[PDB]
Amino acid sequence: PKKTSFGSLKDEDRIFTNLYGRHDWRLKGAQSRGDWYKTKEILLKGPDWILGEVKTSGLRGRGGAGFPTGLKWSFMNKPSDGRPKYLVVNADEGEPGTCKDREIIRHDPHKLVEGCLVGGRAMGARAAYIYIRGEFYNEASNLQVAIREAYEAGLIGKNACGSGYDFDVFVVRGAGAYICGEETALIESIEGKQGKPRLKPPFPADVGVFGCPTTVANVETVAVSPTICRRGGAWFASFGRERNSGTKLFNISGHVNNPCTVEEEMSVPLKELIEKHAGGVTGGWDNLLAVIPGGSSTPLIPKSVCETVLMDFDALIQAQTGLGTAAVIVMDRSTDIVKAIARLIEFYKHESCGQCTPCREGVDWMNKVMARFVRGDARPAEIDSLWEISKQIEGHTICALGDGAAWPVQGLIRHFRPELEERMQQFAQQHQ
Amino acid sequence: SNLIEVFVDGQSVMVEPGTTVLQACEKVGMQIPRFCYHERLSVAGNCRMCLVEIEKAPKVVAACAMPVMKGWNILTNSEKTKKAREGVMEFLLANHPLDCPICDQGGECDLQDQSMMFGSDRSRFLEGKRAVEDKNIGPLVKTIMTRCIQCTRCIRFASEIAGVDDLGTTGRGNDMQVGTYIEKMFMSELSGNIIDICPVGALTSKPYAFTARPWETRKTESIDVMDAVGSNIVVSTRTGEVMRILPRMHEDINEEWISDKTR
Amino acid sequence: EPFDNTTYKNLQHHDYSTYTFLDLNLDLSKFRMPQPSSGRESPRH
Amino acid sequence: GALFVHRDTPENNPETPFDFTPENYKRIEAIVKNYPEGHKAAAVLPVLDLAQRQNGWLPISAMNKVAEILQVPPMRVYEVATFYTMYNRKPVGKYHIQVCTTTPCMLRNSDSILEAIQKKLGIKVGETTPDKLFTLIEVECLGACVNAPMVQINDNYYEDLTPKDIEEIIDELKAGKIPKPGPRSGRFSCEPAGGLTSLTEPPKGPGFGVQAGL
Ligand SMILES: Cc1cc2nc3c(=O)[nH]c(=O)nc-3n(C[C@H](O)[C@H](O)[C@H](O)COP(=O)(O)O)c2cc1C
Ligand code: SF4
Ligand code: SF4
Ligand code: SF4
Ligand code: FES
Ligand code: FES
Ligand SMILES: [K+]
C-alpha cells in the first residue's frame, strides 16, 4: 500500500532531465528527451481531460503558495463572455534562496513552452505571456530562441501541432522588482503600470491582465504539465505523501559543502536531502544552527526540528514554517543568526511596493528594530513589542509580501529568543 | 427581488448585489473608518483603516473594496476589528510629523479624529521619523509632504475628476513620494479641491494659511455667484470677517466640488 | 549518440549582445496571430 | 543621490537631445504589437528599457519621448522609471558592477567579494570611477544563490567568485576583454561540485512512460 519513507528518486522518474544543461537545450535536444512528443493528442482530448489529469496528480502550486493547481486552472474553464483569455507564466523568481526557475528556462526552454500550450489549452487561452525577471537577460534570450524554433516547427502559433488550436507565446521582461512575482503585481507590470498588487475578490480568473480572464502559474508548475498529461496523473501521485504528491526541485544553498540545485521526491527528509545531494552541512550535521526550508519568506527552524522534518507542505506547516519554493538555506553555528535575519528584513524593506500602510511603514519599522537587535542596543521588552508589530502586518496587507516579512521575524523570536536577550546584556554592560 | 440579505452586528439589512461592506454598514448608521476611500473617487484599498471582521472568517476584509455576500454578518465593533484599526493607526502615525500646532488641518483632521476614536493612546515607536522635501505645485495649494499618508486621493481626483494626469507616486516602499516628479504647477479650474479631499495637512490652502482654526469659524451656508452654475458653498467667518469658502454638498449641482475662482 | 555527459551544452549565451532579445521579438512578429481589440485606441479615448 | 524628484540641470533637462534610432523604431513597433489593440500603454516597460539600452541611462528627455510615442501621460512614465531599480536615472559607467548581498550570498562571504572590488577600483559602494568605467552598487537576490557569491555586470552573471576571481574579471574588462559568463569554479551551472548526484543515466527517448490513451 502507501509508502512511509520518501526519497531516492530514479532518473527515469525525474521530469527535468536536462536540469544541469549537459545536453542540447534546443528543439532537437528537447524532442529526443520526450518533449513535444504526441502533443497533438493531448490537445484533442479537450480541456476537461487535461484538467482531470492535473486534479488526479494532486499537483500543487510551486510558486510559494501551494494551491491545488488542477483546481486552480478550472476557473478559466468557463464559456466565453466576449473577452480574450490569457495565461501568465510567472518566471520572476525573486525569492531569496530560490534558483529553480532559472534552470528550467535556461536548460529546458521547451517543456516550459510546451507547458504553455497544454496549460493554455486547459484554460482555453489564446496566448501566453511569460514574465521573466529583468536580470535574467541571457535566460530570456534562450527562451526566445526556443519560442522561435517552436513557431518555425509549427508547434505553436496558428494551428498548433496540427490540432486546430491557435496559441501564441510572448515573453515580457521585468525591470527589477521582487514584488512583480506576486500574481496581481505581475499583471499590473505587464499592463505598463507600477508593480503594485491588486486587491481581491476581483480574481484574475474573472478580471486579469488587460481586464481579462487570466491564470498566473509558476514556471515549474507549467513546465511539468505536459509530462503529467503523458505519463498520467496516477504516475505523478505515486510520489510524496498524500496531498503532497509529486517531484520537487530543491535549491540547497548557504553553509553546505556543495550548494546545488537538484530534483527530489516530495516528502524527502530534510536531513537526507542535505546529506545525500548537498554533501552535508559545513562541519557535519553538528555545526548546523538553523535552516530556512522554503526561501526567506518561510520562518527558520532550529537543528532539533531539522532532525526528522520532511520536505512537504503539511509536514513543514506542522513545524511552524512552510515549504515555499523549496529553497533550503542552511546556516551553521558560526553564523550571526540575528544578523542573517536582519538582512532578510532589509531585503523586504527594499522590495515593499509601498502601496498599503502595514508594509510601507511596518516593514521599515521592523528593519530599524532588527538593526538595533543586531547591535544589542535595545531592551528585552522590545522583543515582545517586535512580535506584536509583526502580527499587525500579517493579514492586514493587500499582498503576501507583508506576511513574508513578518514570518522571518517570528521564527527568529520563537527559536532564538535566548540569543537576542544575551546580545542585549553584552551591549548594556559595555555601553554603561 | 434581487436584493440579498446581509447582517451588520446581527441586524438584517437588504442590499443590492455589488454593494460593498462599507456601504452595507452605511444603511444601519455605522460609518467605517477610512483614509483612502472616497465615494466620488475610484476604490484604492491601500490605507487598510477600513479592515473589518466577518463572522466565521479568519481574515479581516477591506470594507471599502469587498462586496458583501449573502448571509454575511459584519462585526464592526469586535475585538479583532478593533485591534486592526489600532495596528493600522499605529503605522500611520509612526513617521507622521509632530506638526499639529503648526498644521492648518488641526481641529478638522481625519487622522487626528480617527486616532482619538479608533487608535491607541500612546506611542511605542522608538526610531527616527521620515522627512520628505516639499514640492511646489502652484500659488494656491501649499504642499508639506512630510504629512502625507500616501492615500492617493489627490492622484485619483486629479485623474478622474479634473482630467489632469500630473500627480503620481515616485519611489517605492517607505520612500514612495506623491508629487509631480518634475517641477510642475497643478494648475486647473478644479485644483483647489485637492485641499478638501486630502485627509491630512499635506495639501492646504495657501491664501488661508495660519489665519484661523476650524473650531472658531462660523459656517454660513450660502450660494456662489462667480458663474451661473450656482454652486452651494459654505462661507467661513471669524469675528465679522470672511476667512474662506468651502464646498457644500448638492448632488444635483456641484456635488462637493467648487471651481478655483469660487474658492 | 555520443553520451558526453561531461560537457556544458549551453554556451550560446556567451555571444548574445545588447539587442539580442529585442531582435528575436522582432523576428517573431511574422508568426503572431492578430491581436484582439477593445474597440478604442486607449482608455482615454 | 537616490532621489526621486527631478531637478533640471544642463546635462539632464527636457531639451536634452534624445530620439530613437531608425532601427529602434522598428523594434518599438514590434514590441507595441505584442499587446492587444487599445492597450499600447503596456509597452512602457520594454520601450523604456530599449531607450536605456541605446543611451545607457534615462534622461528626462528620454522619458518624455517614450510618453509621446505611446500616447501616455509623462507622469505615468516617471512612475515606472522611478519604481523599478534597473532603470538608470543618472549616468553610470559602461560596466555596472552589481554585488548581491542578501543572506544566501552573505552567508558565503559575499562581503569579501565587495571589499576586493572596492580596494581594486579605489571607490566606495554607489560611486563611479573618475574615468566613468565602473560603478559599484549592492543589489538584492539575483536568482543565483546556489552559485553564491556572485555579481552581475551589464547583462552577464559571474558566479562562484572569490576575492581573486573577481579581481581577474575586472582586469579583463578594464583593458579590452569580455570575460565569459558563468561560474568561476570547476562546475558549469548549478550541479553539486564534486560529481553529479543525479541525472547520471542517459535520458529516456521519445515516448517513455506514456499511458494508454494520451
Ligand atoms: C511577494 C511575492 C513574491 C512572489 N514571487 C513569485 C515568483 O517569483 N515565482 C512564482 O511562481 N510565484 C511567486 N509568488 C506567488 C504568486 O503570487 C502566485 O501564488 C503563484 O505564482 C501562482 O502560480 P502557481 O500555481 O504555480 O504557484 C509571489 C508571491 C509574493 C507575495
Ligand atoms: S504588503 Fe507591501 S508589497 Fe504588498 S501591496 Fe502592501 S505595500 Fe505593496
Ligand atoms: S495632518 Fe493632522 S495629525 Fe498630521 S500634523 Fe496636521 S493636524 Fe496633526
Ligand atoms: S497628499 Fe494628501 S491626498 Fe495626496 S496622497 Fe498624500 S495624504 Fe493623500
Ligand atoms: S478606506 Fe479601505 S483601505 Fe482605505
Ligand atoms: S542571495 Fe545572492 S543571488 Fe540569491
Ligand atoms: K487637507
PDB file of C-alpha atoms in Angstrom, chain A residues 11-12 14 16-17 19-20 22-23 31-33 37-38 41-42 45 49 53 86 93 96-99 102-103 106-107 129 133-138 170 172-173 175-177 180 189-195 210 229-232 254-256 258-262 277 329-331 335 339-340 343-344 347 350-351 353, chain D residues 33-36 39 41-46 49 53 76 79-80 82-87 98 100-104 106-108 138-148 152 154-157 159 181 187-194 196-214:
ATOM      1  CA  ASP A  11      16.427   9.414 -13.058  1.00  0.00           C
ATOM      2  CA  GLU A  12      13.735   7.643 -15.094  1.00  0.00           C
ATOM      3  CA  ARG A  14      12.693  12.803 -12.950  1.00  0.00           C
ATOM      4  CA  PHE A  16      13.654  17.911 -15.681  1.00  0.00           C
ATOM      5  CA  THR A  17      16.142  15.587 -17.364  1.00  0.00           C
ATOM      6  CA  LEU A  19      18.473  20.370 -15.243  1.00  0.00           C
ATOM      7  CA  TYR A  20      22.256  20.834 -15.372  1.00  0.00           C
ATOM      8  CA  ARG A  22      24.627  18.862 -20.140  1.00  0.00           C
ATOM      9  CA  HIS A  23      22.594  18.062 -23.275  1.00  0.00           C
ATOM     10  CA  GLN A  31      12.411  16.205 -28.621  1.00  0.00           C
ATOM     11  CA  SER A  32      14.981  13.442 -28.121  1.00  0.00           C
ATOM     12  CA  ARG A  33      14.218  13.631 -24.379  1.00  0.00           C
ATOM     13  CA  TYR A  37       6.044  14.132 -28.120  1.00  0.00           C
ATOM     14  CA  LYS A  38       2.443  13.357 -29.061  1.00  0.00           C
ATOM     15  CA  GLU A  41      -3.226  14.034 -28.986  1.00  0.00           C
ATOM     16  CA  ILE A  42      -3.159  15.862 -25.642  1.00  0.00           C
ATOM     17  CA  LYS A  45      -8.751  15.409 -25.724  1.00  0.00           C
ATOM     18  CA  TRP A  49      -9.307  15.695 -19.832  1.00  0.00           C
ATOM     19  CA  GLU A  53      -5.102  14.724 -15.106  1.00  0.00           C
ATOM     20  CA  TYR A  86      -4.573  34.678 -21.441  1.00  0.00           C
ATOM     21  CA  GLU A  93      11.948  34.058  -9.464  1.00  0.00           C
ATOM     22  CA  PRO A  96      15.945  34.791  -1.910  1.00  0.00           C
ATOM     23  CA  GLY A  97      17.465  31.330  -1.974  1.00  0.00           C
ATOM     24  CA  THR A  98      15.371  30.311  -4.995  1.00  0.00           C
ATOM     25  CA  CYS A  99      17.093  29.361  -8.250  1.00  0.00           C
ATOM     26  CA  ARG A 102      16.357  29.815 -13.712  1.00  0.00           C
ATOM     27  CA  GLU A 103      17.402  26.313 -14.785  1.00  0.00           C
ATOM     28  CA  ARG A 106      17.842  28.262 -19.472  1.00  0.00           C
ATOM     29  CA  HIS A 107      18.187  24.487 -19.993  1.00  0.00           C
ATOM     30  CA  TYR A 129       2.687  35.925 -21.610  1.00  0.00           C
ATOM     31  CA  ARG A 133      12.988  38.530 -14.304  1.00  0.00           C
ATOM     32  CA  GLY A 134      14.708  41.503 -15.899  1.00  0.00           C
ATOM     33  CA  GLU A 135      18.123  40.478 -14.582  1.00  0.00           C
ATOM     34  CA  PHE A 136      17.805  37.104 -16.370  1.00  0.00           C
ATOM     35  CA  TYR A 137      18.787  38.579 -19.716  1.00  0.00           C
ATOM     36  CA  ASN A 138      20.636  35.522 -21.026  1.00  0.00           C
ATOM     37  CA  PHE A 170       5.033  36.115 -25.734  1.00  0.00           C
ATOM     38  CA  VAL A 172       7.892  40.188 -21.457  1.00  0.00           C
ATOM     39  CA  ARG A 173      10.855  41.166 -19.299  1.00  0.00           C
ATOM     40  CA  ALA A 175      12.585  45.725 -14.700  1.00  0.00           C
ATOM     41  CA  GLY A 176      13.964  44.751 -11.284  1.00  0.00           C
ATOM     42  CA  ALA A 177      11.225  44.439  -8.667  1.00  0.00           C
ATOM     43  CA  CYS A 180       6.389  41.669  -9.527  1.00  0.00           C
ATOM     44  CA  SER A 189       3.531  45.189 -14.610  1.00  0.00           C
ATOM     45  CA  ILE A 190       2.525  43.608 -17.929  1.00  0.00           C
ATOM     46  CA  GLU A 191      -0.010  46.431 -18.297  1.00  0.00           C
ATOM     47  CA  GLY A 192       2.655  49.144 -18.062  1.00  0.00           C
ATOM     48  CA  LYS A 193       1.951  50.345 -14.519  1.00  0.00           C
ATOM     49  CA  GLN A 194       3.886  50.110 -11.274  1.00  0.00           C
ATOM     50  CA  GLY A 195       4.301  46.653  -9.799  1.00  0.00           C
ATOM     51  CA  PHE A 210      -5.913  43.853 -19.600  1.00  0.00           C
ATOM     52  CA  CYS A 229      -0.632  14.543 -19.215  1.00  0.00           C
ATOM     53  CA  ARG A 230       1.560  11.948 -20.937  1.00  0.00           C
ATOM     54  CA  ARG A 231       2.760   9.738 -18.083  1.00  0.00           C
ATOM     55  CA  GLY A 232      -0.571  10.266 -16.324  1.00  0.00           C
ATOM     56  CA  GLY A 254      24.266  28.571   2.275  1.00  0.00           C
ATOM     57  CA  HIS A 255      26.585  26.696   4.643  1.00  0.00           C
ATOM     58  CA  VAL A 256      26.724  23.382   2.812  1.00  0.00           C
ATOM     59  CA  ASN A 258      28.265  21.552  -2.318  1.00  0.00           C
ATOM     60  CA  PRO A 259      25.442  24.065  -2.817  1.00  0.00           C
ATOM     61  CA  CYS A 260      23.428  22.870  -5.781  1.00  0.00           C
ATOM     62  CA  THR A 261      20.045  22.562  -7.465  1.00  0.00           C
ATOM     63  CA  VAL A 262      18.632  19.033  -7.624  1.00  0.00           C
ATOM     64  CA  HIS A 277      22.820  15.734  -2.547  1.00  0.00           C
ATOM     65  CA  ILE A 329      19.095  27.937   3.161  1.00  0.00           C
ATOM     66  CA  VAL A 330      21.498  26.343   5.648  1.00  0.00           C
ATOM     67  CA  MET A 331      23.162  28.287   8.471  1.00  0.00           C
ATOM     68  CA  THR A 335      26.560  32.367  11.642  1.00  0.00           C
ATOM     69  CA  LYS A 339      22.380  39.424  11.510  1.00  0.00           C
ATOM     70  CA  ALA A 340      21.318  36.832   8.928  1.00  0.00           C
ATOM     71  CA  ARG A 343      19.458  41.220   6.183  1.00  0.00           C
ATOM     72  CA  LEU A 344      16.261  39.427   5.159  1.00  0.00           C
ATOM     73  CA  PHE A 347      15.549  42.849   1.768  1.00  0.00           C
ATOM     74  CA  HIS A 350      13.787  47.375  -0.230  1.00  0.00           C
ATOM     75  CA  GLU A 351      11.150  45.280  -2.030  1.00  0.00           C
ATOM     76  CA  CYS A 353       5.962  48.175  -3.269  1.00  0.00           C
TER      77      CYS A 353
ATOM     78  CA  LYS D  33       2.213  44.742 -31.367  1.00  0.00           C
ATOM     79  CA  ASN D  34       2.692  42.173 -28.577  1.00  0.00           C
ATOM     80  CA  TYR D  35      -0.287  43.638 -26.691  1.00  0.00           C
ATOM     81  CA  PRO D  36      -3.980  43.966 -27.555  1.00  0.00           C
ATOM     82  CA  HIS D  39      -3.638  48.824 -24.595  1.00  0.00           C
ATOM     83  CA  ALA D  41       0.448  51.604 -22.523  1.00  0.00           C
ATOM     84  CA  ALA D  42       1.510  48.006 -21.824  1.00  0.00           C
ATOM     85  CA  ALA D  43       4.732  48.722 -23.757  1.00  0.00           C
ATOM     86  CA  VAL D  44       6.182  51.316 -21.368  1.00  0.00           C
ATOM     87  CA  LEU D  45       8.491  48.891 -19.559  1.00  0.00           C
ATOM     88  CA  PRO D  46      10.122  47.307 -22.650  1.00  0.00           C
ATOM     89  CA  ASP D  49      14.431  49.651 -21.356  1.00  0.00           C
ATOM     90  CA  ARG D  53      19.980  50.253 -23.905  1.00  0.00           C
ATOM     91  CA  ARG D  76       2.942  57.714 -15.766  1.00  0.00           C
ATOM     92  CA  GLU D  79       6.229  56.493 -12.068  1.00  0.00           C
ATOM     93  CA  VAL D  80       7.570  53.456 -13.931  1.00  0.00           C
ATOM     94  CA  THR D  82      11.307  55.650 -10.502  1.00  0.00           C
ATOM     95  CA  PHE D  83       9.638  52.407  -9.384  1.00  0.00           C
ATOM     96  CA  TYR D  84      11.953  49.845 -10.990  1.00  0.00           C
ATOM     97  CA  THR D  85      15.573  49.651  -9.879  1.00  0.00           C
ATOM     98  CA  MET D  86      17.105  48.538 -13.184  1.00  0.00           C
ATOM     99  CA  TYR D  87      16.241  51.818 -14.906  1.00  0.00           C
ATOM    100  CA  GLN D  98      26.101  44.798  -9.001  1.00  0.00           C
ATOM    101  CA  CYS D 100      24.451  40.621  -4.340  1.00  0.00           C
ATOM    102  CA  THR D 101      24.427  40.892  -0.548  1.00  0.00           C
ATOM    103  CA  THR D 102      21.233  39.118   0.550  1.00  0.00           C
ATOM    104  CA  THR D 103      21.548  36.366   3.145  1.00  0.00           C
ATOM    105  CA  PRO D 104      22.244  33.307   0.925  1.00  0.00           C
ATOM    106  CA  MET D 106      26.083  36.931   2.591  1.00  0.00           C
ATOM    107  CA  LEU D 107      26.483  33.514   4.220  1.00  0.00           C
ATOM    108  CA  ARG D 108      29.092  32.549   1.607  1.00  0.00           C
ATOM    109  CA  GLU D 138      24.770  46.343  -3.905  1.00  0.00           C
ATOM    110  CA  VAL D 139      21.674  44.545  -5.179  1.00  0.00           C
ATOM    111  CA  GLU D 140      19.247  42.020  -3.743  1.00  0.00           C
ATOM    112  CA  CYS D 141      18.971  38.347  -4.670  1.00  0.00           C
ATOM    113  CA  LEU D 142      19.796  37.912  -8.357  1.00  0.00           C
ATOM    114  CA  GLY D 143      18.418  34.374  -8.592  1.00  0.00           C
ATOM    115  CA  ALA D 144      21.785  32.566  -8.465  1.00  0.00           C
ATOM    116  CA  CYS D 145      22.060  31.789  -4.765  1.00  0.00           C
ATOM    117  CA  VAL D 146      23.394  28.246  -5.188  1.00  0.00           C
ATOM    118  CA  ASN D 147      26.284  29.858  -7.094  1.00  0.00           C
ATOM    119  CA  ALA D 148      26.999  32.362  -4.334  1.00  0.00           C
ATOM    120  CA  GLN D 152      26.214  40.980 -12.321  1.00  0.00           C
ATOM    121  CA  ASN D 154      25.607  44.578 -17.505  1.00  0.00           C
ATOM    122  CA  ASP D 155      23.652  41.520 -18.758  1.00  0.00           C
ATOM    123  CA  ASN D 156      26.053  38.774 -17.622  1.00  0.00           C
ATOM    124  CA  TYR D 157      26.390  36.756 -14.415  1.00  0.00           C
ATOM    125  CA  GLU D 159      29.406  33.232 -10.184  1.00  0.00           C
ATOM    126  CA  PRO D 181      29.804  34.491 -18.054  1.00  0.00           C
ATOM    127  CA  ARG D 187      31.343  23.415 -12.155  1.00  0.00           C
ATOM    128  CA  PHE D 188      29.206  24.550 -15.071  1.00  0.00           C
ATOM    129  CA  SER D 189      25.838  25.907 -13.881  1.00  0.00           C
ATOM    130  CA  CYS D 190      24.438  24.537 -10.614  1.00  0.00           C
ATOM    131  CA  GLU D 191      25.431  20.874 -10.275  1.00  0.00           C
ATOM    132  CA  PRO D 192      26.812  19.527  -6.991  1.00  0.00           C
ATOM    133  CA  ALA D 193      30.522  20.302  -7.042  1.00  0.00           C
ATOM    134  CA  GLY D 194      32.421  17.043  -6.722  1.00  0.00           C
ATOM    135  CA  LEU D 196      26.648  14.700 -10.165  1.00  0.00           C
ATOM    136  CA  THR D 197      24.393  13.098  -7.562  1.00  0.00           C
ATOM    137  CA  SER D 198      21.554  12.689 -10.084  1.00  0.00           C
ATOM    138  CA  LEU D 199      20.860  12.699 -13.821  1.00  0.00           C
ATOM    139  CA  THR D 200      23.859  10.462 -14.497  1.00  0.00           C
ATOM    140  CA  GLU D 201      21.971   7.928 -16.624  1.00  0.00           C
ATOM    141  CA  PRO D 202      21.057   8.554 -20.276  1.00  0.00           C
ATOM    142  CA  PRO D 203      17.762  10.419 -20.714  1.00  0.00           C
ATOM    143  CA  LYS D 204      14.861   8.335 -21.953  1.00  0.00           C
ATOM    144  CA  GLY D 205      13.625   8.608 -25.510  1.00  0.00           C
ATOM    145  CA  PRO D 206      10.546   9.976 -27.272  1.00  0.00           C
ATOM    146  CA  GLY D 207       7.714   8.121 -25.553  1.00  0.00           C
ATOM    147  CA  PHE D 208       8.926   6.678 -22.259  1.00  0.00           C
ATOM    148  CA  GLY D 209       6.202   6.067 -19.686  1.00  0.00           C
ATOM    149  CA  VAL D 210       3.333   7.115 -21.961  1.00  0.00           C
ATOM    150  CA  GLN D 211      -0.054   5.972 -20.677  1.00  0.00           C
ATOM    151  CA  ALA D 212      -2.649   4.133 -22.771  1.00  0.00           C
ATOM    152  CA  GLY D 213      -4.586   6.924 -24.465  1.00  0.00           C
ATOM    153  CA  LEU D 214      -2.524  10.121 -24.428  1.00  0.00           C
TER     154      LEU D 214
END
